[PDB]
């Protein structure tokens with residue numbers, strides 16, 4: 001069966017509702033005060049988190065070595081609570097998955113769980129006119145309002161929802177190495 | 189935890205998308221070719237079931253002995269498939285419940301599961317100007333598009349969703365005796 005309990009434990013401890021100029025997004029918190037949001041949410045220097053205006057201390061829009069959009073933005077937030085560290089639930093590598101759940105946490109839908117079925121490593125996607133890499137595809141008619149939703153199987157947090165064409169949904173991958181403690185680059 | 193597996197087994201074998209002049213509703217099939225739908229769906233003599241136009245052979249709008257709306261309409265349908273008989277999962281009596289799931293099956297949401305928490309036997313509700321009895325209440329901001337959605341706990345199918353005020357959701361009760369094989373009244 002689909003891993004509803006796992007999905008629910010992630011939603012309960014590791015999501016917040018985030019709101020930018022582009023609207024509301026489910027927001028997965030990963031560790032400390034670091035979270036993710038689709039790049040097309042256009043995060044600026046402040047964001048609403050559960051309706052509380054919040055400084056965005058850092059925002060990194062991920063791109064691969066071909067200089068292509070990965071559609072993940074990692075944000076660091078000025079808030080008091082630390083997120084439970086869920087980095088050990090992130091996959092090490094690209095992969096296909098079975099029987100995944102897509103979980104949403106917005107004002108309209110404070111917790112909703114959608115079994116999306118099989119998830120395939122899809123690769124290239126033209127996302128609203130933006131070439132994008134490292135996409136996961138599921139055959140489910142996902143909708144507006146579901147962006148940022150968390151895609152899990154039991155024991156793994158695998159992506160966040162970023163797109164769909166009416167029949168399929170698409171998630172940007174999460175990989176363990178996006179979040180490993182590291183060294184010193186000038187990045188802005 | 190919430191009974192997601194049970195909810196999913198009911199959705200998979202016993203729901204269809206129903207469409208009337210009022211729009212789409214999740215439709216719970218109970219036994220044979222008998223199903224339910226909120227009364228305010230205004231069922232006529234034909235209905236779409238999974239987009240196939242279908243004769244409604246019978247429609248009974250339930251009312252209690254005070255001649256008050258219960259908001260359940262029982263329909264008998266001209267179709268080939270019989271529903272799995274789920275009458276043994278219907279509660280015998282009015283009751284309060286813990287940790288319920290609300291499940292939806294429409295074109296926009298082909299399967300979505302929402303933990304709504306505690307469900308209380310609420311009684312009287314003024315439903316869009318219509319006095320209504322035998323209502324169940326949960327504290328969840330349910331929305332348009334969720335009418336007809338199935339409210340379960342493990343082992344029990346307890347109601348179908350019919351209303352909400354922005355903060356609470358309301359379901360009409362299902363009771364085992366609504367569907368017991370019976371005798372002879374002229375009812376139209």
Ligand SMILES: *[C@@H](CC(=O)OCC)[C@H](C[C@@H]1CCNC1=O)NC(=O)[C@H](Cc1ccccc1)NC(=O)[C@H](CC(=O)OC(C)(C)C)NC(=O)OCc1ccccc1
Nearest residue numbers: 022038040041126127128142143144145147162163164165
């Ligand atoms: C989530 C964000 C949102 O609601 O927009 C606020 C600005 C949303 C979710 C998908 C929309 C439809 N169903 C979904 O699952 N994502 C998008 O809208 C996304 C851009 C975006 C904006 C903000 C944050 C993240 C992402 N754009 C798309 O998904 C497009 C929509 C689209 O073009 O759909 C139609 C084809 C018009 C129906 N999807 C897309 O480009 O898919 C690839 C494609 C495009 C054209 C033909 C075939 C396939």
Ligand SMILES: *[C@@H](CC(=O)OCC)[C@H](C[C@@H]1CCNC1=O)NC(=O)[C@H](Cc1ccccc1)NC(=O)[C@H](CC(=O)OC(C)(C)C)NC(=O)OCc1ccccc1
Nearest residue numbers: 210226228229314315316330331332333335350351352353
């Ligand atoms: C499902 C049906 C639908 O979408 O309408 C198609 C005609 C819908 C679900 C609720 C609407 C808002 N959230 C919900 O969970 N039910 C209704 O719209 C229902 C009438 C109906 C129509 C068709 C089939 C079944 C039922 N009406 C209500 O739920 C009303 C809506 C309402 O008045 O909401 C506001 C107060 C305007 C926000 N709800 C209601 O009457 O609640 C009691 C109440 C009323 C006024 C003040 C406080 C409490």
